[model samples]
Target: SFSLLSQITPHQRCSFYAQVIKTWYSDKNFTLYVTDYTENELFFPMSPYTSSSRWRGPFGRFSIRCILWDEHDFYCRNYIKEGDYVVMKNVRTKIDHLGYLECILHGDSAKRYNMSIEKVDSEEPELNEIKSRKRLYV
Candidate 1:
């Protein structure tokens, strides 16, 4: 079973499944905003075509900001898409400046060989709490 995003600890290496909800890149680097399956609906109004810089904010505890260093940057820019299911292994976790947990996939380390990213066909389950949040209130 995939671990909840909330369970990931700082500096711990682990694997989990999440959807690539947003990807940001600049002339300098690339970053991915991801979320566990249950949080899929949180990104409902956003799409891959939107500029990455346009999607900014604290994602609370349900999302992860994954930084892709080295070759991982090229791969993600070309292959990963919004809503794609990916399994991230051997990722090192860190806390970002905003005090949110972020994951780092190092492409230059030997462990990078063990780290993998691939698309999978899986459906997200209906989460009642998330569903309640989705409904608009007047």
Candidate 2:
């Protein structure tokens, strides 16, 4: 079963689905800016706290999705078009600079249990759970 956005712990493994709202990368390392539209204590406000940058996603503490993926961390690095609902399994968590939470995926972890990070349709029931949050309130 997938884990809750807030329930995922630092130094632990988790799997969750999210919308690929924004993205960035250089060479092989890719940064996937995602969100399930939930709040967590570790995620600082990505907006209002400072001037706007490249990302134009939602503001506030909705930035816990600083996901990092290496070139070898499974497929879809180039296939992931923005706005696709993606599923990530077996990635470990970390609290990086700015005190915001981050998730990193690697090949070795996938090799151990066969990781699955793929594009899911936007209307999938799993996605609906997150959709509720994204539109639930302000």
Candidate 3:
């Protein structure tokens, strides 16, 4: 079963499957926000106090937003693109000052090979709507 991302608390380590619906990159900092669409079963009940406007976009609600730093940024920037199904592993969660839950995925390093990513095949119905829609990534 796909994990309900909002149910995972800060500092918790979890792995799950998601399709990248959007990507934000900063060339100066080499940071990335690899965001996704989760099933309503998994997304809708998040912190009631938080503003829905923050999560909803032209693509609808993005339940999980994964942040990649340093080498992790460069690695994913080259391989990940919108609509790709990905498996994110060994990432830790954190509650940002804004009270938004953020998944922090790190790159391979000597001290810790704490996070990794893999592209996989998916037939998730939740993603069919996105799969059917055509959009330019440029």
Candidate 4:
């Protein structure tokens, strides 16, 4: 379809937006960017884009990921897809020590939203990677 071909895949756009959305909610402060949420999706702005040293707590047990718009809770339910676009939102990772914060999100206020990626800039780092092995999770 022309419409579909004219737009970026939700996965591609979300991944890009997620990077920025993460920074918008990070305590460390980092660079972020965002595009219009023209698709059927709700967006949440939180978390960090750092390769390491992210929020830690009981609620941080799971990694943040996007879900089907139809599956979203009530509060921000209507904020996402209205039959034309995709919806994306932020979720506290339930992993490590960050789980503490994730538990706070009751699938309400800090829940579903449209992506408006945020970010901060910096240039003072010097920590060599122990190894280039990537830790995959979904």
Query: For this target, which candidate reaches the highest lDDT against the unseen true structure?
Result: 2
Angstrom error of the Cα, residue 66, model 4: value is 4.8
lDDT string, candidate 2, 1-138, tens digits = 687776777887788888887876666676777878876777667664566466656676665654555544335656776788888877778888766788877645546765567889877887888777877644
Clashing pairs in 3: none
Report each candidate's C-alpha RMSD, comma-separated, in the order given.
Answer: 6.6, 2.4, 7.0, 17.2
Flag the better candidate by lDDT, 1 or 2.
2
Q: Model 1 scores what on Cα lDDT?
A: 0.62
What lDDT, from 0 to 1, does candidate 2 have?
A: 0.71
lDDT tens digits, residue span 29-71, model 1? 6777776533422222334355555543224345667888878
**In candidate 3, what are the lDDT values of residues 36-91, reduced to their tens digit?**
43333322234435555342222433465677777778777777877677777667
Q: 13, model 4: CA deviation in Å?
A: 22
Model 2, residue 52: distance off in Å is 5.1
Q: In candidate 2, what residue range of length 10 has the lowest lDDT sum?
A: 66-75
> Which prediction has more favorable lDDT, 1 or 3?
1
Poorest stretch of ten by lDDT in candidate 1: 37-46
TM-score of each: 0.67, 0.82, 0.61, 0.18
Q: What ranking emerges by TM-score with the best candidate at the front? A: 2, 1, 3, 4
Candidate ranking (lDDT, best to worst):
2, 1, 3, 4
Q: In every candidate, how many clashes are there? A: 0, 0, 0, 39
